[PDB]
Amino acid sequence: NRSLIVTTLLEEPFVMFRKSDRTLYGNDRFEGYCIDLLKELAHILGFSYEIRLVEDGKYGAQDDKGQWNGMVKELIDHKADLAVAPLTITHVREKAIDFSKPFMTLGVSILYRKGTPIDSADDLAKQTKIEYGAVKDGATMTFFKKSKISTFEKMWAFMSSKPSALVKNNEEGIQRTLTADYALLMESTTIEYITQRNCNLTQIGGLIDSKGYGIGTPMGSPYRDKITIAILQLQEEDKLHIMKEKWWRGSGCP
Ligand SMILES: C=C(C)[C@H]1CN[C@H](C(=O)O)[C@H]1CC(=O)O
Ligand SMILES: [Cl-]
Ligand SMILES: [Cl-]
Ligand SMILES: [K+]
Ligand SMILES: [K+]
Numbered sequence: 001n002r003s004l005i006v007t008t009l010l011e012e013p014f015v016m017f018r019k020s021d022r023t024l025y026g027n028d029r030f031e032g033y034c035i036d037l038l039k040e041l042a043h044i045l046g047f048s049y050e051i052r053l054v055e056d057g058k059y060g061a062q063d064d065k066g067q068w069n070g071m072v073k074e075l076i077d078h079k080a081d082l083a084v085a086p087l088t089i090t091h092v093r094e095k096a097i098d099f100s101k102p103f104m105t106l107g108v109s110i111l112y113r114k115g116t117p118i119d120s121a122d123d124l125a126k127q128t129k130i131e132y133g134a135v136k137d138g139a140t141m142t143f144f145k146k147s148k149i150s151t152f153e154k155m156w157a158f159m160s161s162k163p164s165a166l167v168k169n170n171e172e173g174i175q176r177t178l179t180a181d182y183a184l185l186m187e188s189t190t191i192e193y194i195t196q197r198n199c200n201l202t203q204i205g206g207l208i209d210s211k212g213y214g215i216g217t218p219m220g221s222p223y224r225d226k227i228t229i230a231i232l233q234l235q236e237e238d239k240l241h242i243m244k245e246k247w248w249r250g251s252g253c254p
Contacts, residue, residue: 004049004223006038007071007080009057011170013193013247014086027051033247037103038084040239044230047223052080059087060096061137069137072097075218082223083216088139088187090211092146098219100228102212103240104189108140110204111177111184111191120205124183125154132158132183133165135173140185141166143209152208155185177201196250 008015008030018024018031030051042049060072068076071083075097089099110121110132118124124132132155134141144156159165167173173184174194183204191203215231217224234240 001047004047004081005079006049006051007054007074007083008034008051008085009054009059009071011086015084033243034084034086036243036246037240040234040243041227041230044233045223045226049082054080059085059138060093061142062092063137068096071216075216078218081217081221082227085216086187086189086213087216088211089214090139090142092142093139093216096219098217098221098224099214100217100224101231102214103231103234104213104244105210106187106189106212107207107210108143108185109188109191109207111174111186111194111201112204113177113181114200114202118183118204121155121208122151124204125151128158130181130183131162131165132185133167133173134159134185135169136166139211140187144185174198174201193248193250196248196253199253 010016013032014034015030015032017029027050038049054071054074056069058070060068060070063069067073071080071085071087072093074080075083086104087099089102093099110124112118116130118130124130134144141159144152144159147153147156167176167184170186170190173186176182177184178198178201188203188207195201195203215224215227217227231240
């Protein structure tokens with residue numbers, strides 16, 4: 001039947017503008033892990049799509065008392081059929097949209113420059129000399145905002161009090177860790193990609209929690225179950241592990 005509308009956002013190495021001399025248009029403009037996954041799902045399920053970058057360039061957060069923005073809002077409003085992106089599956093977003101079963105699992109951890117030998121978030125929580133933060137209005141910020149763990153409660157207090165500590169996006173966050181005394185609270189799979197390519201960066205400690213990335217849909221979407229079955233089939237054959245290795249494999253560090 002009709003082409004589905006796919007909403008997404010630029011983010012390495014999930015979704016990128018591929019390199020070309022020509023001016024690209026339509027779906028051809030895109031490559032990455034999420035594009036490979038989307039192609040595999042479209043082939044398996046027999047659907048076509050038109051990819052659209054979400055206008056406001058956000059994932060989705062509950063800004064107002066109630067109202068959503070970003071890809072989540074796009075899904076709430078049925079402006080897109082699918083959100084294909086590293087969209088973190090959270091019980092709070094589940095109050096507004098549905099997800100497929102997760103195609104990738106991960107957790108929050110810390111990105112930091114190699115130097116002052118901290119080894120945990122606790123080390124970060126009990127000082128202020130090293131500024132730390134998260135991407136504003138993202139899953140990670142939301143995790144801290146609503147935590148009951150005292151260590152993270154203290155971190156939220158600092159992060160929220162000083163707005164100059166939250167960043168607009170990953171590129172701004174990574175650049176800050178590279179040019180200032182700044183630790184970034186970031187999802188582990190991105191950290192893994194980054195530390196492989198930036199040998200002076202490292203992950204501090206291990207994973208704080210567990211979560212996954214899933215394909216977002218409007219609640220009660222007829223494609224949600226089909227997409228889930230297909231994702232689970234790919235997983236049984238270790239295809240998603242292979243796909244990740246394809247986009248993640250770096251050149252390696254000293
Ligand atoms: C702003 C990015 C890159 C996204 C990706 N996953 C989280 C989300 O789905 O909101 C965000 C990262 C984070 O908040 O650690
Ligand atoms: Cl577009
Ligand atoms: Cl897999
Ligand atoms: K070009
Ligand atoms: K079609």
